[PDB]
Amino acid sequence: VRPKITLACEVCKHRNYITKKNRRNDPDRLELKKFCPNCGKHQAHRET
Amino acid sequence: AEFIYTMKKVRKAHGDKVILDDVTLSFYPGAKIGVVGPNGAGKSSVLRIMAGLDKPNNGDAFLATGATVGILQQEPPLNEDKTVRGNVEEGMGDIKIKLDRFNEVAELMATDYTDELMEEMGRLQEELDHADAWDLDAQLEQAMDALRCPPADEPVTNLSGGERRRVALCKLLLSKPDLLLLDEPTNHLDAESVQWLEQHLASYPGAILAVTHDRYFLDNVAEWILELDRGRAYPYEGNYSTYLEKKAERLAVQGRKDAKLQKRLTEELAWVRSGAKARQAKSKARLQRYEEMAAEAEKTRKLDFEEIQIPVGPRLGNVVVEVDHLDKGYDGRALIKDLSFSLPRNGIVGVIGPNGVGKTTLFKTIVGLETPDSGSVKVGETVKLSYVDQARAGIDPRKTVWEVVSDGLDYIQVGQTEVPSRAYVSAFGFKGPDQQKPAGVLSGGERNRLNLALTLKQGGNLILLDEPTNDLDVETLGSLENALLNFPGCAVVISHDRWFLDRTCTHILAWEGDDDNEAKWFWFEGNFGAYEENKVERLGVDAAVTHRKLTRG
RNA sequence: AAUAUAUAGGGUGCGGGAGGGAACGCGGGGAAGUGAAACAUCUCAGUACCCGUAGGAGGAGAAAACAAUUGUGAUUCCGCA
RNA sequence: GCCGCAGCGAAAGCGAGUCUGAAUAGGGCGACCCACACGCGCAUACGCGCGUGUGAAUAGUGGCGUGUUCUGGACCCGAA
RNA sequence: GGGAUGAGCUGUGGGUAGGGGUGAAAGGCCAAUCAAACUCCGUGAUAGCUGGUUCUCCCCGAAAUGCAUUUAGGUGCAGCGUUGCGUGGUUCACCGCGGAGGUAGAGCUACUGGAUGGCCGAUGGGUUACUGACGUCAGCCAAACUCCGA
RNA sequence: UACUAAAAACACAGGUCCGUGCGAAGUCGCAAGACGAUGUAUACGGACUGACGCCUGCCCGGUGCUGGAAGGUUAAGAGGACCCGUUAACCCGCAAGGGUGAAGCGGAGAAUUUAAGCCCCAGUAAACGGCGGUGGUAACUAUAACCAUCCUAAGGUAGCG
RNA sequence: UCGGUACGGUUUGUGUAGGAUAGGUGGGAGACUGUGAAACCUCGACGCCAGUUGGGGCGGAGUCGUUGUUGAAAUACCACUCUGAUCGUAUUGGGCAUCUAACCUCGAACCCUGAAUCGGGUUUAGGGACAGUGCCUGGCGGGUAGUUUAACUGGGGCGGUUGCCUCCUAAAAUGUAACGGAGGCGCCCAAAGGUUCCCUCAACCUGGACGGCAAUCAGGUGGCGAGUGUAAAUGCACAAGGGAGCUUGACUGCGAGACUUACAAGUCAAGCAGGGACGAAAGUCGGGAUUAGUGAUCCGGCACCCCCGAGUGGAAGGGGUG
RNA sequence: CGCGGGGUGGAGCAGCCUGGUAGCUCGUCGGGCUCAUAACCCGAAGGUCGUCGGUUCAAAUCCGGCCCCCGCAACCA
RNA sequence: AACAUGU
């Protein structure tokens, strides 16, 4: 019901962060602006 | 032994609802596979892996090299351009820009450097003889005469539900992908567009999948049934009369096997409550087998179905709907011309006609969303009107299936009574935490069930059914037609399903236009079986074609 | 010989084998107690025991070897690593 | 041959430094006598860095005793 | 005391062997030993268990608690003992000062509950001598009550 | 039960079931070979019952045993698409690197094809086993021949207490 | 006999004008000696997209090309072969049937054999590529073998309990046992997080269409009795309670110093740099008022970094960081 | 005393695991059929889901506290 | 094939 999703970047596709969401309140893939250490700046992050 | 598509241990699941689990099958070219199953079985989730739109969780699923994949979605989208521009974005999409550059290099190269652009038009003019793409003006004019498309100069925002599906089939039958993925193709198509597509998919190079609920289209375009039960896939052969045999047999040998397990729990639960005697021990190796039998007896508890239930309305008078000399159109084309009828009390009326002929416009003058040209529509003081719609315009995607029926409210009105809202939607199959799915993730078979929950809560004694037999399977198609026969008011049905108007009808209103009038209708007093015998005695005795190839190859 | 070519077999004449020995050698079969604070993989251990067969010793031994850009040059055994 | 004589790092490797890190940021681990006048761009005074020493205190390794310890029956006696 | 011409008794010679034999069946019997004989060997089997461990004297001197444990009569580490080298009053006792508390007691019209007798009477019960909510005047109670407080 | 139990315990003649078509089934042995038996279904081995008399009811759901093969599931062998490692050759090139890559040899190997078994389909209780609750009802009380209902594969018959 | 593959014959394709529309490509101006308008034959392959693509009977009288155009393209004839059909040969598998020669016979006779119910050999009567046996492989398997089957406990068994979080017992720091007294947990939230601004609750009383003890309104009174996603305690009206705007700090690289502690763990943290959110700024932000919502090591899985690469270049494998 | 099952209209039972709509057969009540009664046919009434108090928008159901009924263990000396 | 009874 609350699986562990992982957040891949949108430029480099590195998998920088891991967190949990609710599957039934949020059926789509989450999008957050998170810091990417490869790019050195805040990028966008969908899930996988 | 050369293949098209292979699945290796694919397991896609939306948590508790598994769709595949440890499946493996291979698709070879020339195969004609029709995929069946109940509503919500997972049939469109398989084709969204086979088209590369979704990814399986833990498995391998890949197309072979070459032989690209074109999918017909269950709700096919279009663009905001014309019809002739609606067929070039696919089928001609990778090849018209190679002609959009050749008519550019005829003039831009003549004033620039003529040495490096010699091969820039060289590697593109040799891409116009292997495909014969010079006739792109007149290949589109052949593919529209086959499907009987609308005229290709008007926009596509105001089209029929079965005219948008004709221009979406032309986007795929021109591409000719070697793996077709048709998701419910016979929705909204008349008895001509289905009979055409049976002959076109008969002699077709490549693999064809088609998730078709209907009993007669799959007997013509398929010879190898694929099935989806709760997770598994059962490939075999037959012509869909053997699918209802095997699903009836797979539940009679699973149903009584799960009854022998229930008697062995009662014989064993009596042992674990019987108390240890003198200094003997109750064995741990029987407690640990009871709690494995008691765990494998709760995982089999998915056996339920909800019937279609229409609320009854107030008393219906002697005058239901009267139509006197109705004329209706939008342009120089006239749809309805000089129509006179009156809806009976306590009957089922069927509206019959091909696509784009004026059937949804006939309801939208009755419900008060249009305006007649000449003649009037007259209702009466008793009638409360209930109207389901073809377009499903009431349901919005980014809102859950509960709080579209309700609006965050607990108790709703379904016509002079107050039933609870979650008790109302669970009477429409949406049970438990399936009540929090939004409308974008619901299947097509349960947006034809959610639309019946939005609009039948008006509780009226006149229901207008605008294609209700659209995405429903055989179990709930019979549950709908058994809810119209027991309905006390009057029900009006638009449908293309020949074996659905034959079963539940009392009156027929059918289009009978010909070449000199093109806009006349006909009111008949009787069932559908007596209409087809009268149709072949009034107009054209034994007269009421050859397959247009859509291409020169 | 049966039965024909012949063989199995039988007659005669010279050699050889057999069994014992305390340890050591080679080849083959192969435990459990035990240790694992229980136990089955694992250990104990290829130990105890058994079988075949020697010799004054036995086995191995004359590269279808190692090594790493140079090179060592049959085997066994002792010391290191 | 063994122990000592340089450490740090997963390693490549660098080496009184090194690993991490974008960092001449901070930590980890390692190295480094100001008891000493003097000389130095020291100074209200102690110091900072480097010479001159007043010639500061490091140090390991091999044997033989002892106390524990490891592998062997391992302090001795005793099963079913 | 039972059988005593029988499924009898007995002599001489022989056959069956150890997870095997034999059994008119008792786990009976297989050399006074049998829910798996005896002897040699592995072998000085192992035992968180009981027993034992030998000459003297001088200095100091415990513990039976914590935590973990297929652990609870066992054991690892800490606590407490001795001794070697460092550190040198840092330990401890008293006096003065700087500080946190909510026990004892007490209080409750300061809260949450319990509860005694008056008074006023919403309601409930048949127009009312029965019920007496909430309020108020007095007297009280509390390990999981506290405006307080050694 | 030598050595605390001689009995109601074992045996028994009679009974029924099941196995066995003949170097049989069964047993002793790795095997050869032997017993069975110098026998041949009125014979031999197993299981239960235990002279005789009258009798031996109902239940095939469970677990066995016997038969069956339409369907599902299922091993090694056969098969070897597809993807991967190597590099002849080739391209952009700083020719310090990258990219596409034939054949051969490899690594990992899918579809397909395939028996018994198990699921499945029946039979069998002198096969191992199993043979019900609750409430009302008659000329005084009492008891129910009778009835209602729920459940089961079947609801304990003759006899006895 | 039923299939697979390789090879070859015959045959198949018809939206719209048309020679029912060579199917594709390439060659091509000839090809046969001409009546599906024929005589025995005469679509009874398919027969539908119907008449051209056969029942190959014969005839040197009797069709068709190129031109004409009528089209994306043509017209005969033919090698070239895609989709489907059928025929033939070759080479390979699977069924079934027959054979005999391997193998089998405790059926019979004869010899070695003087004495032989053993054994061996010869011959005959049968069985037969099966059976048996080797190797690989599924099944079945208390027939047999090795073992396991926890502890606490007012004896043991039976019943209950085992880790985490809050209170009381607990004797006014911390800690403290019992099968002592009460309760919670194995989550939830994409806002219920971050920030900036703004507001005060419950209960009671008076007036009001439906409307009642209590829905929404209006006014008095009300300093915490409401509220806190969830148990209890400690907190919170300065709000940590209610509402709104923009948002992702539910960050990457760290960490002076502490708490707690046998050890393993647990917990708090000023501040420094990167790149951000909100704010006019000051500043605040490394999830949630706080304390539960979890599992050491080993063995593995995946993503990325390109550290090692068993002669060398790679690779297989290993290593780091999440 | 301890385990663990039960209470639903006059009688018998579902519904309970998986929360929203109280059902089934008989009986009672009114009307038919018949000379009359049973049988049968038609229409109806009847529930505080043992009791109260929490979770929830909502409880017969989920969770605790009580009041009755039924079954089962109580062994080794 | 409906199909019992009348102290």
Ligand SMILES: Nc1ncnc2c1ncn2[C@@H]1O[C@H](COP(=O)(O)OP(=O)(O)O)[C@@H](O)[C@H]1O
């Ligand atoms: N994105 C999603 N997230 C969660 N649940 C989904 C999603 N998509 C589908 N489902 C669930 O899984 C089921 C599968 O839908 P599906 O059966 O593939 O549609 P169709 O009936 O058209 O094949 C649906 O009934 C739906 O309830």
Ligand SMILES: Nc1ncnc2c1ncn2[C@@H]1O[C@H](COP(=O)(O)OP(=O)(O)O)[C@@H](O)[C@H]1O
């Ligand atoms: N708003 C409009 N304006 C113009 N034409 C319309 C509009 N709506 C529908 N039409 C035309 O009316 C024709 C008939 O539609 P109709 O048959 O009523 O739809 P349905 O098939 O759903 O009944 C369609 O061809 C469509 O082009």
Ligand code: VO4
């Ligand atoms: O185009 V329609 O199927 O709604 O007639």
Ligand code: VO4
């Ligand atoms: O593919 V459906 O089961 O939604 O008609």
Ligand SMILES: [Mg+2]
């Ligand atoms: Mg949301």
Ligand SMILES: [Mg+2]
């Ligand atoms: Mg669908």
Ligand SMILES: [Mg+2]
């Ligand atoms: Mg329509």
Ligand SMILES: [Mg+2]
């Ligand atoms: Mg000898």
Ligand SMILES: [Mg+2]
């Ligand atoms: Mg052992």
Ligand SMILES: [Mg+2]
């Ligand atoms: Mg051990």
Ligand SMILES: [Mg+2]
């Ligand atoms: Mg031990």
Ligand SMILES: [Mg+2]
């Ligand atoms: Mg010699």
Ligand SMILES: [Mg+2]
């Ligand atoms: Mg030698």
Ligand SMILES: [Mg+2]
């Ligand atoms: Mg090192």
Ligand SMILES: [Mg+2]
């Ligand atoms: Mg440093």
Ligand SMILES: [Mg+2]
């Ligand atoms: Mg006597």
